Ligand binder design. Sequence first.
Ligand SMILES: Nc1ncnc2c1ncn2[C@@H]1O[C@H](COP(=O)(O)OP(=O)(O)OP(=O)(O)O)[C@@H](O)[C@H]1O
Ligand SMILES: Nc1ncnc2c1ncn2[C@@H]1O[C@H](COP(=O)(O)OP(=O)(O)O)[C@@H](O)[C@H]1O
Ligand SMILES: [Mg+2]
Ligand SMILES: [Mg+2]
Ligand SMILES: [Mg+2]
Lengths: 381, 380
Amino acid sequence: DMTRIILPGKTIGIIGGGQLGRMMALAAKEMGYKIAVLDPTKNSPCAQVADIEIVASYDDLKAIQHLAEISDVVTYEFENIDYRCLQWLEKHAYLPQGSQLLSKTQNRFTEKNAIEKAGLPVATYRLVQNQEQLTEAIAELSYPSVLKTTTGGYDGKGQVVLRSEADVDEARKLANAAECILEKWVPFEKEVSVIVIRSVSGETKVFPVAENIHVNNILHESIVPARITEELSQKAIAYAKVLADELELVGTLAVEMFATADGEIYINELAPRPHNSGHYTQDACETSQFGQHIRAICNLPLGETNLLKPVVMVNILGEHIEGVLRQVNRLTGCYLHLYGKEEAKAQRKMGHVNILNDNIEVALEKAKSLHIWDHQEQLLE
Amino acid sequence: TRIILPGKTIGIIGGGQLGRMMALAAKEMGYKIAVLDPTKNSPCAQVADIEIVASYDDLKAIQHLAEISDVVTYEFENIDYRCLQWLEKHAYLPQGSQLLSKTQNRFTEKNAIEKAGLPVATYRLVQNQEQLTEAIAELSYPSVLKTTTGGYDGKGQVVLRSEADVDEARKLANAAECILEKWVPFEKEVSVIVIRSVSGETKVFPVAENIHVNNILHESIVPARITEELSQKAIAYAKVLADELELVGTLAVEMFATADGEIYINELAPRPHNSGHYTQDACETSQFGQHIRAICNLPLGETNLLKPVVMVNILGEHIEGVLRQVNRLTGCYLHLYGKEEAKAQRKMGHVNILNDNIEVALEKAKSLHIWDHQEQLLEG
Ligand SMILES: Nc1ncnc2c1ncn2[C@@H]1O[C@H](COP(=O)(O)OP(=O)(O)OP(=O)(O)O)[C@@H](O)[C@H]1O
Ligand SMILES: Nc1ncnc2c1ncn2[C@@H]1O[C@H](COP(=O)(O)OP(=O)(O)O)[C@@H](O)[C@H]1O
Ligand SMILES: [Mg+2]
Ligand SMILES: [Mg+2]
Ligand SMILES: [Mg+2]
């Protein structure tokens, strides 16, 4: 039903109480929605901003029941929720996002198929389930190549880059531990992402293309506008609309891409949720990805996605938090977001800072001059 | 000097929509929130970590808020002297009590404005009938008699157009201490929100043009449709006030702008203000984000207007229309405060209409037909 509207005043239920849910919840609260959250850990980032907290396991098909009960619409922010858990909600509650898109994007192999069905380029890949299949995959794809677990991967965990035969021993260890795909290395010039939003009624908006810098396989910086040709942007944007189409998107889709020196774009992966590379939108766009996500599922008119000022988002990990607090008096032109996580771990995402400036290169220099991310800048040398 | 770091608790006296919007901005930066409000489940309580339900004059509850808070601020302005002194001395209330004291009495306020070197309409204290008589004689017609305290949304005011109005005026002067002000023939009402941090850093937001109907704000238009010179004058005036009054926190400066290019300061609000809600969607930092930074002594954000805007207030009488017209809200950024009970003239929310062209934004508000009542009252 493409006409159903969840009006301000109603309750939005969110599965997963991480920072993405917290930010959804804050954007929803501005519009006067109530918020219920289910998370296995008490006092999660999202519970700190929610009206109702359900502390329970993600597979607990009774707590989930209770979430459905108290909510007028349900969404997820946790991308590794059991797809069969969602299936109950779309059957017996209101989950306009569906379970289909999630199941496709959760598995790298099935994800590759969806992208190829849509007609867009991917790195050439093979499924790997044992050593014989790894051996054949390497023989067919050669070097350089990258082995990735088909499920559960994040921050490059469950990945091995095969530069030469010397890396095969490490690849074999991983291939034994989990189902994987081997895919060709893409010698891209830049990584970019595009966040596309589509409402229950089919209205579609796309955010500006962000140029992403990863360090140790964790997002470090998002740069908007991406320093790429107008031609690449229109292509990146067209690619995202196509994906929203073929996947019948309702809600948010983050599309990560590789841009090669000849202006070709390879789709790296999809996330059916607000994405770290869209955090810049909170301070630099007319609508944030979180505001958009809420409007999409509630079937409100979408907001505009104009870039109102250039921006560099910098991630704040556990290893940075001390530096941030010490350097707080130097954060002029910097828009701090901290997620309320009670325990820092070195590489855990604790917050982000959006650095706004008319000139993108001055924003970049600001990040450097703060010295908070010396570890990242040293690794990028 | 002192800095209140993310992770600490900000305590707010007053749980209405201004407290709620302060709490939402604070949460983005990782602050905890405690609130005191006389009614359970207030707009701010819905976003707060800790809720204390009590009267604003209950010193024990005020003390309990303070003792669990690393910094205390307020949306409710009428805190009495004994509570204010306690807070200033035993809690951390960087805004202090001096500015608040000056802004709570219209005569004290106009005095402080003039002492700061700024223009206001000619005015006289009115404490009895004989002073009203002399004041009417001095200022002539037209003039406006207002109560010095308690006054908000217009009530406790008599416009004196002729001798025929003296009667209702004597009646008001009978009930309350008043001021008589000379009528300012103004073209526009405008306001400027100015921010000054604990350490003295200042930022000033763009001039807004304010349209009141029944003395409740209806619309704020930004940029105000005034000359570059009036605009520049208004901004300079607000800066002088912030400096002279040693502002810490937020100060809304409401002004009258004449066709002749004059500015008179009308009144001050030492808090985020309804005429600054446009900043949530149209500026680089909202008045709420700025307020938090100011009192916590963080570097202030920029106040650049990033897109022209018309803010329209949503009263109890409007909420039905807003919900019915939801699918027509393209380019309109809705804010609703979570108030449990509606009332006809109660502020339930606001909508920020963004557009490269101010007149298109204004036309959008009209075309929605939600505010027909306001538009007709403006017509006549
Ligand atoms: N085929 C490839 N060629 C070149 N670089 C690659 C390739 N695959 C991955 N990378 C690099 O490794 C980074 C992480 O890869 P990927 O996004 O597949 O891992 P992830 O664990 O899924 O990350 P996330 O935290 O976004 O979920 C990429 O952003 C890219 O820089
Ligand atoms: N001196 C004056 N000259 C002309 N108009 C005035 C004057 N004082 C008040 N008004 C009109 O009355 C309205 C309300 O006065 P104000 O002092 O703002 O009361 P309140 O504190 O209730 O808002 C103003 O918006 C303006 O239209
Ligand atoms: Mg995926
Ligand atoms: Mg990735
Ligand atoms: Mg007024």
